[PDB]
Enzyme design. Structure first.
Site, PDB file in Angstrom:
ATOM      1  NE  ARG A 126      -3.903  -2.258   2.272  1.00 33.15           N
ATOM      2  CZ  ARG A 126      -3.744  -3.359   3.050  1.00 33.15           C
ATOM      3  NH1 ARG A 126      -2.844  -3.427   4.038  1.00 33.15           N
ATOM      4  NH2 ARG A 126      -4.552  -4.430   2.865  1.00 33.15           N
ATOM      5  CD  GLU A 137      -1.052  -8.142  18.723  1.00 32.65           C
ATOM      6  OE1 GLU A 137      -1.680  -8.120  17.645  1.00 32.65           O
ATOM      7  OE2 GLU A 137      -1.593  -7.858  19.824  1.00 32.65           O
TER       8      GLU A 137
HETATM    9 CL   LIG Z   1       0.119  -4.029   2.084  1.00 29.22          CL
HETATM   10 CL   LIG Z   2      -5.560  -3.171  -0.328  1.00 31.52          CL
END
Ligand SMILES: [Cl-]
Ligand SMILES: [Cl-]
Ligand SMILES: [Cl-]
Ligand SMILES: [Cl-]
Ligand SMILES: [Mg+2]
Lengths: 178, 178
Positions: free
Chosen positions: B66, B103
């Site tokens: 992204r 995490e």
């Molecule tokens: Cl991603």
């Molecule tokens: Cl996405």
């Protein structure tokens, strides 16, 4: 100014032997990406090729991850939206799925069920056309939404490895043959 | 003029309960991407925020995947190149590496060792500033080259989760606060 652009794009794609495993040539796009003009010219050469063939998509789709790069670049140039085609487990909402065989064994690709309207004419973008297995899978995925494939375009094509033949029936473009 | 653009961007981000696992609210940028103006407005509104701040980068870096998408669109808007910051084993030539905590375990990121020049001022672009772990890893990777960090910009920031604090000493911009 059309030929000159191609030679520019070629010149920023480095051949790297023996990656990711011994006995394969890799085409490294990173010098193309890093050049301020590389993605612009690539996207513009692709748009020129789509104009020459009369392909007028309503929306762009790209596979994870280099398809994201060239797909977003070309979508901005055409003024269309973009739909990511992803590896399983990354999309949050309802998906369609297609399982396909490839070199290392097999895997899946996914899209959201609402990625495309029934009205959409979907351009697939990807870096490289080889056997054409991922591109076929991607095509099969799109058709599960009832949208239609307007065509497929690649930065690169590897000669005679069968990809164009598997995608016969879809309009296929590639800027560079290796 | 420009708070209209912020409203449009917000209106296209899905909020999805219990994804990827129960308890957590996933922000889903896919309707934003699909929209023909999503990416254009996201990148313009990042450009506007940079220009308000007098930040003038020489190159854009973004993490897989992204970060590729928002990073590439922004780089196109600004007239700059792009460097992908990738998961291990993807980049074909010599890399630098930084192991970062999350995490349940650690992960790592890589860049080509020759990605940035000594003169570069790198803008880091990503979808979401949550803890700051991947952002900070990325800042460390850039600073293994001779280059410097100009700043970081995100589409979204999870308020008071600590990301800005971890990015102490780097300028941080986010379009939307959740
Ligand atoms: Cl991603
Ligand atoms: Cl996405
Ligand atoms: Cl790459
Ligand atoms: Cl990839
Ligand atoms: Mg699901």
């Amino acid at each position: 100014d059309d030929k000159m652009n191609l030679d520019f794009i070629k010149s920023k794609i480095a051949a790297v032997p023996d990656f990711p495993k011994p006995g394969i040539m890799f085409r490294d796009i990173t010098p193309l990406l890093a050049d301020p003009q590389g993605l612009r010219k690539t996207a513009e050469a692709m748009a020129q090729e789509l104009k020459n063939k009369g392909i007028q998509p309503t929306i762009v789709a790209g596979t994870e991850s280099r398809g994201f790069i060239f797909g977003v670049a070309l979508a901005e140039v055409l003024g269309l939206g973009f739909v990511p085609v992803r590896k399983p487990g990354k999309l949050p909402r309802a998906t369609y799925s297609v399982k396909y065989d490839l070199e290392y064994g097999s895997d899946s690709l996914e899209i959201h069920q609402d990625a495309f309207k029934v009205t959409d004419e979907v351009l697939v973008v990807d870096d490289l056309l080889a056997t054409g297995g991922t591109a076929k899978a991607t095509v099969d995925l799109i058709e599960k939404t009832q949208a239609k494939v307007a065509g497929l375009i690649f930065v690169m094509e590897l000669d005679g490895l069968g990809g164009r033949e598997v995608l016969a029936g879809y309009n296929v473009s590639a800027l560079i043959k290796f």
